[PDB]
A paper describes a structure:
Upon movement of the stereocilia induced by fluctuations of the surrounding fluid, the [name]-CDH23 ‘tip links’ trigger the opening of a mechano-electrical transduction (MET) ion channel at the stereocilia tips. [name] belongs to the cadherin superfamily and consists of 11 extracellular cadherin (EC) domains, an extracellular linker (EL) domain, a single transmembrane (TM) helix and a cytoplasmic domain. Here we demonstrate that [name] forms a robust complex with [name] and that the assembly is composed of 2 copies of each protein, thus providing concrete evidence that the composition of [name] in the tip link is a dimer.
Unlike the linear ‘top to bottom’ arrangement of cadherin domains, the [name] and EL domains sit ‘side-by-side’, providing extensive interactions within each protomer and throughout the dimer interface. A ‘major’ dimer interface is formed by contacts between [name] and the EL domain of the symmetry related protomer (EL’). A ‘minor’ dimer interface is defined by contacts between [name] on one protomer and [name] on the second protomer ([name]’). A top-down view of the [name]-EL dimer illustrates how residues from α1b and α2b of EL form a negatively charged cavity harboring a deafness mutation, Q1347K, at the end of the α2b helix. We examined the fit of galactose, mannose and glucose to the density and found that mannose fit best. Although the mannose moiety does not directly interact with other residues, it fills the [name]-EL dimer cavity and may help stabilize the dimer.
Residue numbers in the entry: 1144 to 1387
The structure:
């Protein structure tokens, strides 16, 4: 008689500082090893105490969806290590467990993947596309996890203020469980841009003929942060100050 087994031993996710209350973070799932059943699994989180009556995150008991339960203003680099449990038979059966890491980021952690297909196409296939991106990042940083911040129209024009809904801006970041924070955005750029032709070939079954990533770019918000004189420090190979 065997306990529920989570599909991953370790779920990694992220939230941005501006995430709304009860925003989706990630979904967990456990099944019975012998039958594959999962229709009666009750999911619960085990989170350490948080100040001020905040609860951090909740999980939908019967769907496994983890959602935010507090705001994350100014909390870039905060991290939440907790557990999720699954108990079969609506709580009356055996239990399994997995670890969870959620890291807080902002636009200083992100890169924009620009594609020549509409955002609805990218969104529809996002699970398969994220898994491909994971593979390339994990070759450089084992165990890292790519997270999708947003999928939208391609931004362009002055200050990237115009929207082209026939193309797509896919804003991503990656969380490193060794550091409990995001991978440096310029390292993330190097990982993706350096393999852009290989990633494009892997994306072909999903983007269709003629579809490809056009470029990787840094969010416009990063330029606004430097103009305000924030997060500026030393970086390697340059005398110009770049936001951290
Ligand atoms: C809730 O929705 C987010 C995206 O909005 C997913 O990334 C997550 O896995 C869950 O399905």
């Amino acid at each position: 008689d065997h306990p529920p087994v989570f599909q991953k031993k370790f779920y990694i996710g992220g939230v941005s500082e501006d995430a709304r209350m009860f925003a989706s973070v990630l979904r967990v799932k456990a099944t019975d090893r012998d039958t594959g059943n999962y229709s009666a699994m009750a999911y619960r989180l085990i989170i350490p105490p948080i100040k001020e009556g905040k609860e951090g995150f909740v999980v939908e008991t019967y769907t496994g969806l983890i959602k935010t339960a507090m705001l994350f203003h100014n909390m870039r680099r905060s991290y939440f290590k907790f557990q999720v449990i699954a108990t079969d038979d609506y709580g009356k059966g055996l239990s399994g467990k997995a670890d969870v890491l959620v890291s807080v980021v902002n636009q200083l952690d992100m890169q924009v993947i620009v594609s020549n297909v509409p955002p609805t196409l990218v969104e529809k296939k996002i699970e398969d596309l994220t898994e491909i991106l994971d593979r390339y990042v994990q070759e450089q940083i084992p165990g890292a996890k790519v997270v999708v911040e947003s999928i939208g129209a391609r931004r362009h024009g002055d200050a990237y203020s115009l929207e082209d809904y026939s193309k797509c801006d896919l804003t991503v970041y990656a969380i490193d469980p060794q550091t409990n924070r995001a991978i440096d955005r310029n390292e993330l750029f190097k990982f993706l841009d350096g393999k852009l032709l290989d990633i494009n070939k892997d994306f072909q079954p999903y983007y269709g003929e003629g579809g490809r990533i056009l470029e990787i770019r840094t969010p416009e918000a990063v330029t606004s942060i430097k103009k305000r004189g924030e997060s500026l420090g030393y970086t390697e190979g340059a005398s110009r100050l770049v936001p951290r």
